Each structure stands twice: as structure tokens, then as C-alpha cells.
């Protein structure tokens, strides 16, 4: 499931459209995106 991160209270809340760009456990504005299980590959050099 796509969710995001509240930068302030550290509570992972998702975001649908026609919604406030806010937190909802605190009242914070700036909000950052988390990652999920996705394949990335690297050389060990």
C-alpha cells in the first residue's frame, strides 16, 4: 500500500486525491514519502 510519512509526529498516513496536504494525527504541513519493497541492483564495486 502506498503511504507517506508525517515529518512531525512520525505517523504513516496515505494520501488520496481531493485531500489536504496535511498531517491528521498532528497538524503538520511538510510531509515526506516512504519506500516499499522494490528491486534495485548494485555492483559490489
Amino acid at each position: 500500500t502506498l503511504k507517506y510519512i508525517c515529518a512531525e509526529c512520525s505517523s504513516k498516513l496515505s494520501l488520496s486525491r481531493t485531500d489536504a496536504v496535511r498531517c491528521k494525527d498532528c497538524g503538520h504541513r511538510i510531509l515526506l514519502k516512504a519506500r516499499t519493497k522494490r528491486l534495485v541492483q548494485f555492483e559490489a564495486r
Binding site: 510519512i5 515529518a7 509526529c9 512520525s10 505517523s11 515526506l32
Partner: protein, 69 residues
Amino acid sequence: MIVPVRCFSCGKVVGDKWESYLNLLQEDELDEGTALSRLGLKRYCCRRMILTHVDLIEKFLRYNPLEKR
């Protein structure tokens, strides 16, 4: 950041001995060099990785973006 795996010049694996100097001064209670001698301490082409390392990963981990407070 964390302790390097391999000695840069020589190449001995040095992710091994980072942890015995509190107990060298709390359990063994010595001064510096007596505690800097015994436990497998051998070459000042890689004895630096005791004295030289900073281990800045402790200062990052307090900035967790994933926990309350």
C-alpha cells in the same frame, strides 16, 4: 560512519576489535596503553583503526525519521 571491513593498505579484516575499551577501563580499569596492548593488538600499519576511527554512525541514528519522538 561504521568501521571499515578491510585494512586499506594491508588488508586484514578489521571489523573485529572495536568494542573492548570500555571494558578495558570499566572491567579491566587500566590506563590507555596497557589496555592498548594485549587483546590481539599487533601492527601499526593497521593499529590505526583502533585510534583513528570516529564511528559517526552513532550521531546519525539519533535522527530517525521513522519513530515517534
